Design an enzyme around this catalytic site. Structure first.
Site, PDB file in Angstrom:
ATOM      1  N   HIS A 454       0.837  -1.214   0.000  1.00  0.00           N
ATOM      2  CA  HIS A 454       0.000   0.000   0.000  1.00  0.00           C
ATOM      3  C   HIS A 454       0.869   1.261   0.000  1.00  0.00           C
ATOM      4  O   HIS A 454       0.703   2.136  -0.859  1.00  0.00           O
ATOM      5  CB  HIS A 454      -0.944  -0.002   1.178  1.00  0.00           C
ATOM      6  CG  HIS A 454      -1.845   1.194   1.260  1.00  0.00           C
ATOM      7  ND1 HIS A 454      -3.167   1.141   0.877  1.00  0.00           N
ATOM      8  CD2 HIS A 454      -1.628   2.460   1.707  1.00  0.00           C
ATOM      9  CE1 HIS A 454      -3.733   2.322   1.077  1.00  0.00           C
ATOM     10  NE2 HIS A 454      -2.818   3.144   1.568  1.00  0.00           N
ATOM     11  N   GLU A 455       1.785   1.370   0.956  1.00  0.00           N
ATOM     12  CA  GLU A 455       2.647   2.568   0.992  1.00  0.00           C
ATOM     13  C   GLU A 455       3.507   2.683  -0.253  1.00  0.00           C
ATOM     14  O   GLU A 455       3.767   3.805  -0.748  1.00  0.00           O
ATOM     15  CB  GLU A 455       3.510   2.632   2.262  1.00  0.00           C
ATOM     16  CG  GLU A 455       2.742   2.562   3.555  1.00  0.00           C
ATOM     17  CD  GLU A 455       1.635   3.582   3.665  1.00  0.00           C
ATOM     18  OE1 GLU A 455       1.716   4.686   3.075  1.00  0.00           O
ATOM     19  OE2 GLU A 455       0.686   3.270   4.373  1.00  0.00           O
ATOM     20  N   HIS A 458       1.633   4.463  -3.045  1.00  0.00           N
ATOM     21  CA  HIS A 458       1.776   5.924  -2.923  1.00  0.00           C
ATOM     22  C   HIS A 458       3.160   6.357  -3.414  1.00  0.00           C
ATOM     23  O   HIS A 458       3.274   7.398  -4.104  1.00  0.00           O
ATOM     24  CB  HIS A 458       1.635   6.357  -1.487  1.00  0.00           C
ATOM     25  CG  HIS A 458       0.239   6.347  -0.958  1.00  0.00           C
ATOM     26  ND1 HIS A 458      -0.799   6.991  -1.591  1.00  0.00           N
ATOM     27  CD2 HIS A 458      -0.267   5.847   0.191  1.00  0.00           C
ATOM     28  CE1 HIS A 458      -1.893   6.877  -0.863  1.00  0.00           C
ATOM     29  NE2 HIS A 458      -1.595   6.210   0.236  1.00  0.00           N
ATOM     30  N   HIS A 461       3.235   6.372  -7.213  1.00  0.00           N
ATOM     31  CA  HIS A 461       2.452   7.559  -7.646  1.00  0.00           C
ATOM     32  C   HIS A 461       3.340   8.788  -7.638  1.00  0.00           C
ATOM     33  O   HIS A 461       3.371   9.561  -8.608  1.00  0.00           O
ATOM     34  CB  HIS A 461       1.223   7.751  -6.746  1.00  0.00           C
ATOM     35  CG  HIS A 461       0.144   8.607  -7.335  1.00  0.00           C
ATOM     36  ND1 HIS A 461      -0.897   9.081  -6.586  1.00  0.00           N
ATOM     37  CD2 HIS A 461      -0.064   9.061  -8.596  1.00  0.00           C
ATOM     38  CE1 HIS A 461      -1.706   9.802  -7.348  1.00  0.00           C
ATOM     39  NE2 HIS A 461      -1.227   9.798  -8.579  1.00  0.00           N
TER      40      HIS A 461
HETATM   41  C1  K26 Z   1       2.667  14.851   6.664  1.00  0.00           C
HETATM   42  C2  K26 Z   1       2.639  14.135   5.299  1.00  0.00           C
HETATM   43  C3  K26 Z   1       1.336  13.367   5.230  1.00  0.00           C
HETATM   44  C4  K26 Z   1       1.468  12.041   6.004  1.00  0.00           C
HETATM   45  C5  K26 Z   1       1.093  13.039   3.763  1.00  0.00           C
HETATM   46  N1  K26 Z   1       0.883  14.257   2.947  1.00  0.00           N
HETATM   47  C6  K26 Z   1       1.663  14.486   1.874  1.00  0.00           C
HETATM   48  C7  K26 Z   1       1.322  15.710   1.047  1.00  0.00           C
HETATM   49  O1  K26 Z   1       2.579  13.737   1.526  1.00  0.00           O
HETATM   50  C8  K26 Z   1      -0.168  12.181   3.582  1.00  0.00           C
HETATM   51  O2  K26 Z   1      -1.282  12.687   3.731  1.00  0.00           O
HETATM   52  N2  K26 Z   1       0.049  10.904   3.198  1.00  0.00           N
HETATM   53  C9  K26 Z   1      -1.056   9.957   2.909  1.00  0.00           C
HETATM   54  C10 K26 Z   1      -1.097   9.612   1.425  1.00  0.00           C
HETATM   55  C11 K26 Z   1      -1.281  10.882   0.797  1.00  0.00           C
HETATM   56  C12 K26 Z   1      -0.209  11.582   0.216  1.00  0.00           C
HETATM   57  C13 K26 Z   1      -0.410  12.837  -0.364  1.00  0.00           C
HETATM   58  C14 K26 Z   1      -1.671  13.411  -0.383  1.00  0.00           C
HETATM   59  O3  K26 Z   1      -1.847  14.644  -0.945  1.00  0.00           O
HETATM   60  C15 K26 Z   1      -2.737  12.727   0.214  1.00  0.00           C
HETATM   61  C16 K26 Z   1      -2.541  11.464   0.789  1.00  0.00           C
HETATM   62  C17 K26 Z   1      -0.833   8.726   3.765  1.00  0.00           C
HETATM   63  O4  K26 Z   1       0.291   8.229   3.796  1.00  0.00           O
HETATM   64  N3  K26 Z   1      -1.936   8.236   4.396  1.00  0.00           N
HETATM   65  C18 K26 Z   1      -1.911   7.130   5.355  1.00  0.00           C
HETATM   66  C19 K26 Z   1      -2.873   7.449   6.506  1.00  0.00           C
HETATM   67  C20 K26 Z   1      -2.470   8.448   7.450  1.00  0.00           C
HETATM   68  C21 K26 Z   1      -1.349   9.288   7.368  1.00  0.00           C
HETATM   69  C22 K26 Z   1      -1.072  10.224   8.379  1.00  0.00           C
HETATM   70  C23 K26 Z   1      -1.904  10.371   9.492  1.00  0.00           C
HETATM   71  O5  K26 Z   1      -1.623  11.305  10.463  1.00  0.00           O
HETATM   72  C24 K26 Z   1      -3.037   9.564   9.595  1.00  0.00           C
HETATM   73  C25 K26 Z   1      -3.287   8.635   8.570  1.00  0.00           C
HETATM   74  P1  K26 Z   1      -2.319   5.515   4.482  1.00  0.00           P
HETATM   75  O6  K26 Z   1      -3.615   5.584   3.773  1.00  0.00           O
HETATM   76  O7  K26 Z   1      -1.204   5.250   3.558  1.00  0.00           O
HETATM   77  O8  K26 Z   1      -2.492   4.592   5.608  1.00  0.00           O
HETATM   78 ZN    ZN Z   2      -2.866   5.305   1.776  1.00  0.00          ZN
END
Ligand code: K26
Ligand code: ZN
Ligand code: MG
Ligand code: MG
Length: 662
Positions: A454-455, A458, A461
């Site tokens: 899953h990771e 991302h 992507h």
């Molecule tokens: C402080 C960085 C953030 C962790 C990151 N944001 C960015 C801009 O990288 C982010 O939102 N990452 C998303 C996947 C994602 C990535 C980018 C996005 O625009 C949206 C989602 C992500 O890894 N989500 C995870 C869930 C999650 C991530 C952080 C939390 O505090 C709570 C839940 P996943 O579904 O892989 O389990």
């Molecule tokens: Zn995710």
């Protein structure tokens, strides 16, 4: 001086972590903000006529120092925080919010953007212009000045409250780690897990004892194996009390302020505001989709609960579900979790599963760089290459739990791809696997294996991004579409020819017998009732927090009533997160968007079928998926990209079949 003031000279712009120290953060944020404010003031007050280049592209070029310090600071605050970083967080986050608002509520800047016509712009440029107008309107650019003044105060209080939520949750989670004095109480636990629990104890200042830290969701892995029912209950209670009381009044205040803000911007609920920038067309379409899924999922959960009651011979508590589920799997499929773990060692899963699939599908290749410096000593850095040998980007993997790392799993970018800047992607994955002692193999549950894929979805992507403007780089798509590339990459963890390549015993190299690997696959369709209900319960909980008529008095009472109203208050199936530890919605970006996972899963399931329709795991199919969808970022309409790839609009039947919901 300060390493954030110049672009990184390292490969792919990898930040100079060896040179970066906590004393650099505040002065680089201060310079970053000052330099970007000046840039915006120069654009806003530019005497030359307004053009795409000197306005929209100019704003895309701005904020280089701020971008650099932000990339590292937020990476560290998630993955390897400390009291100093958390103090800097308290000071800087309010300033960054006020900074973003100083830009979005700059009246001459917005008037300038409105003067740019689409004429003579390529597709992505015209799409960026629209996106900029939307971003400004959504941030309050069209409000009167009194309303702008209140919005600034609302935004600052919201960012402060979300920061407090995350720090509270990290402190309480760490302090609620379960301590066991007598190894006899770990009866049932695999040998490697006992060793990891002793290593955790040693690392957290309790040599000779055993420590079981809590994972992010309600369900704790250990309950599947532990025969001491009093310990199963103690772990379950430690899980469900996270955030109690200190996060209760906090999230009520966050939800209240989100509602006030949404109305101020013309929307009846926070959810209506969120859905306006999601692929879901209306709040009604979301509630309608969920309303179709929930009744069959609950009926499945009831049937499953009866089966576990028959197995156990007696009535169950929530802390018994996993335990009796494992017994059923052993009986039905001959699959014992303790005997599966030896086939899933971190290094082999990574090399012969995750990387392997990506190589067969996309032709990319990986070179580990133990000589390059990550942000923590356990980070593995990998150089990634296209099939033709050209350089693609960097991938950083950070696999283990520690007290400085927040729970769950996530991807982020240190460097975003854009042709504007000529940058290559540098992407990170963080997991929370328990770290073994010196020399011991890292054996994994299949849930952890799935999380790794899953990771990595991302990550891909991010790595495959081929956009012009950084606004659209990599993962910059709506939240109810961003979980499609991640969820669809999980298909490769169970694609049999890939699974057979990596599911080999850690000591002997011996493949799992073909007929047992068959049954391990079968045993994953098991428990779809529980799995679907805990997810839908949390989804509907999130929705209720961001669509209320009147604000709640009490967080725990509100949660109970929300779950009862939605028909998903099941004693044996608590929501996947309860309100006070629902980090997705209170500290990350999934408020009124936890539904994003199942919304995206429609596209995942329908895409698995596309692969079967087109001959499976073939380089031609990887090139198509990469070309048409993964390389686009936010630079095209996501549903149009999906349609051009799939050959038609999405079908929900494949999801329904997967989750047993027909
Ligand atoms: C402080 C960085 C953030 C962790 C990151 N944001 C960015 C801009 O990288 C982010 O939102 N990452 C998303 C996947 C994602 C990535 C980018 C996005 O625009 C949206 C989602 C992500 O890894 N989500 C995870 C869930 C999650 C991530 C952080 C939390 O505090 C709570 C839940 P996943 O579904 O892989 O389990
Ligand atoms: Zn995710
Ligand atoms: Mg899933
Ligand atoms: Mg068979």
């Amino acid at each position: 001086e300060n390493p954030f003031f110049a672009p990184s000279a390292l490969p792919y712009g990898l930040p100079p972590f060896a040179e970066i120290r906590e004393e650099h953060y505040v002065p680089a944020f201060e310079r970053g903000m000052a330099e970007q404010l000046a840039e915006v003031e120069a654009i806003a007050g530019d005497t030359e006529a307004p053009t795409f280049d000197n306005t929209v592209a100019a704003l895309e070029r701005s904020g280089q120092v701020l971008t650099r310090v932000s990339a590292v600071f937020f990476n560290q605050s998630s993955s390897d925080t400390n009291p100093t970083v958390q103090e800097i967080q308290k000071q800087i986050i309010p300033k960054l919010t006020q900074h973003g608002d100083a830009i979005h509520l700059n009246r001459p800047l917005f008037a300038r953007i409105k003067q740019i016509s689409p004429d003579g712009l390529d597709a992505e440029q015209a799409w960026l212009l629209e996106r900029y107008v939307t971003d400004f309107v959504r941030a309050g650019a069209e409000l009167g000045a009194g309303d702008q003044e209140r919005l600034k105060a609302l935004n600052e209080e919201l960012s402060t409250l979300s920061t407090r939520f995350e720090q509270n949750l990290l402190a309480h989670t760490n302090a609620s780690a379960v301590i066991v004095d007598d190894v006899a109480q770990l009866d049932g636990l695999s040998d490697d897990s006992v060793k990891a629990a002793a290593e955790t104890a040693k690392s957290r200042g309790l040599p000779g004892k055993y420590v079981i830290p809590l994972v992010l969701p309600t369900g704790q892995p250990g309950l599947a194996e532990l025969t001491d029912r009093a310990l199963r209950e103690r772990i379950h209670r430690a899980s469900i009390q996270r955030g109690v009381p200190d996060n209760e009044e906090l999230i009520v205040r966050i939800a209240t302020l989100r509602a006030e803000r949404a109305k101020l911007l013309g929307y009846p609920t926070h959810a209506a505001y969120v859905v306006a920038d999601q692929t879901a067309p209306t709040t009604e379409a979301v509630t309608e989709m969920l309303g179709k899924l929930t009744p069959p999922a609950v009926a499945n959960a009831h049937r499953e609960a009866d089966e576990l009651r028959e197995q156990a011979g007696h009535d169950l508590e929530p802390w018994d579900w996993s335990f009796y589920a494992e017994k059923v799997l052993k009986e039905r499929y001959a699959i014992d979790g303790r005997q599966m773990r030896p086939y899933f060692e971190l290094d082999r899963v990574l090399r012969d599963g995750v990387f392997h699939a990506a190589t067969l599908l996309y032709g990319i290749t990986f070179t580990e760089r133990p000589d390059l410096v990550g942000y923590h000593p356990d980070v593995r850095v990998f150089e990634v290459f296209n099939e033709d040998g050209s350089q693609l980007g960097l991938f950083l993997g950070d696999y283990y739990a520690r007290p400085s790392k927040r729970g769950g799993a996530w991807m982020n970018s240190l460097v975003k791809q854009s042709t504007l800047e000529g940058t290559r992607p540098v992407v990170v994955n963080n997991l929370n696997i328990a770290k073994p002692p010196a020399g011991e193999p890292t054996l994994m549950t299949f849930e952890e294996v799935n999380t790794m894929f899953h990771e990595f979805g991302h990550a891909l992507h991010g790595l495959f991004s081929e956009v012009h403007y950084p606004r659209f780089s990599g993962t910059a798509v709506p939240r109810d579409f961003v979980e499609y590339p991640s969820q669809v990459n999980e298909m490769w963890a169970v694609w049999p020819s890939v699974l057979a390549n990596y599911a080999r015993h850690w000591q002997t190299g011996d493949p799992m017998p073909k007929d047992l690997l068959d049954r391990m696959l079968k045993s994953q369709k098991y428990n779809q009732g529980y799995k679907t209900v805990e997810y839908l319960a949390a989804t509907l909980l999130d929705w209720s927090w961001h669509t209320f008529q009147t604000p709640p008095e009490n967080a725990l009472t509100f949660e109970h009533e929300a779950l009862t109203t939605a028909g998903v208050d099941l004693k044996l199936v608590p929501p996947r997160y309860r309100s006070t530890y629902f980090a997705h919605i209170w500290s990350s970006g999934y408020s009124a968007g936890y539904y994003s996972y199942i919304w995206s899963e429609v596209l995942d399931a329908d895409t698995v079928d596309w692969f079967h329709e087109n001959g499976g795991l073939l380089r031609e199919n990887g090139d198509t998926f990469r070309q048409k969808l993964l390389s686009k970022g936010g630079s095209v309409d996501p549903m149009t990209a999906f349609q051009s790839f799939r050959g038609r609009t999405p079908r929900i039947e494949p999801l329904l079949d997967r989750r047993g919901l027909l």
